[PDB]
Structure 1
């Protein structure tokens, strides 16, 4: 384990005229990356590198906010949203670059109107953990939030923002789960439960307009999630195929998109 900033500098090198010392002939059949460097192949000069690599850690790469979900409220009176960040393909691909992730979160709530404005009304955001009863109306008893964490914010206020800890029963969030959640006779036709990790179901996010009568507005609240204190394990290739579903890595059998655009011939660089 080495810990350093900048970038590994080069050293001066001269020509080699001898037998038995061959740094260029590698062997990829051993599953190891080649270790030949600049100095041994060509004659090089000495440079002191200062090109900082602070911006390439997995803690500066993920600590950027990003839309995770949108919640349309018609005012049924209320609206719910099952917390799952794999719904928009911009923050889904960076998280699916890895297999296991352990991180804290920071959600930001941006609520607008139909045409886009901010009327001075009041909104209640309520988090419903797994097992807590979901509200059945806009004036139900679940909104009394004697134990559930809730946020009371207006439309004319700055966007709300809370901090969320690591709330998983396992030791890390896994995006890919190679198994079934239960025992029994699994079918051959419709496996509607394969690849469903129960350690990622975090609950339901509900929102209502705090009032007594019905307010005649169609709102739209966007949830912007940011990751922090993030640890990652077992990297895996980044997806190249377009996404089809939300909880499943389904792709299209026909019209498979190639991972490199076409050119005329193989002997024409351009």
Structure 2
């Protein structure tokens, strides 16, 4: 029929290249610092999209949007530090970890536009995989309180610390939201898209006592209501 409709929107890169909420970090500055374990299966909207495939390799872009409880934007200085695995974790608002000499950091004001950085593919394996069928250790693997059955140690990427650069306590209750965008993406082994509600961040558990049907019920098979 000489069809000219357009199929470019259906590619993986255009499907995955849009920022989405990944993390929320709460700071009291009453401790003086907050930390967050980088793990992006905490929110369901990005999790459902990412778990349609078994293997995924991509670069990322992280944006940080920080506000207060009331929403004001008073001018303060904040330090964002990325602490890779192994490196010491900051212990106070003035500890020796905050003089970052090899670690990357971003100094940003609360009145500034949201901060934005680029991150490469950082896995010791060849791709990030969300499903790892096995244990990361030779052992006995007890049959009651199992855990460690879906660790995938190839996915552990360190922590994110945030502090208020100040002489003393600033008495500021802050909330920073971390938005991630996928760039230069490749994917392998598509899987069924989850139908059951999520329960845990790191496990695929579902409520067996309450299973939801994948299609809404209708009165009879001879109607066309549902």
* TM-score above 0.5, yes or no: yes
Residues 84-128 of structure 1 deviation map (CA, whole Å, 9 limit, x = unaligned): 000000001100011000000000000000111111000000000
TM-score by length of 2: 0.98
Ranges of 4+ aligned residues in structure 1 off by more than 2 Å: none
Equivalent-residue separation in structure 2 for 1:170 and 1:255 (angstroms): 37
Aligned residue for 1:90, secondary structure, equals helix
Q: Which has the higher contact order (CA 8 A, sep 6+)?
A: 2
| Structure 1: unaligned runs, 5 residues or longer | 1-46
Aligned residue for 2:47, secondary structure, equals helix
Equivalent-residue separation in structure 2 for 1:159 and 1:152 (angstroms): 12
Deviation at 1:264, TM superposition (A): 0.4
Structure 1 or 2: larger strand share? 2
Aligned residue for 1:55, secondary structure, equals helix
Deviation at 1:269, TM superposition (A): 1.1
Cα RMSD of the aligned pairs, angstroms, is 0.5
Equivalent-residue separation in structure 1 for 2:73 and 2:132 (angstroms): 42
- 1:216 aligns to what? 171
Deviation at 1:255, TM superposition (A): 1.2
Equivalent-residue separation in structure 2 for 1:195 and 1:108 (angstroms): 28
Residues 193-231 of structure 1 deviation map (CA, whole Å, 9 limit, x = unaligned): 101100101000000000121001100000000000000
Equivalent-residue separation in structure 2 for 1:91 and 1:157 (angstroms): 27
Equivalent-residue separation in structure 1 for 2:120 and 2:145 (angstroms): 36
- 1:73 aligns to what? 27
Residues 149-199 of structure 1 deviation map (CA, whole Å, 9 limit, x = unaligned): 000000000000000000000000000000001111110001111011001
Equivalent-residue separation in structure 1 for 2:142 and 2:167 (angstroms): 49
- 2:97 aligns to what? 142
Aligned residue for 1:248, secondary structure, equals coil
Aligned residue for 1:199, secondary structure, equals helix
Alignment of 1:46-125 (within 5 A): 47-75=1-29, 76-125=31-80
Equivalent-residue separation in structure 2 for 1:177 and 1:191 (angstroms): 15
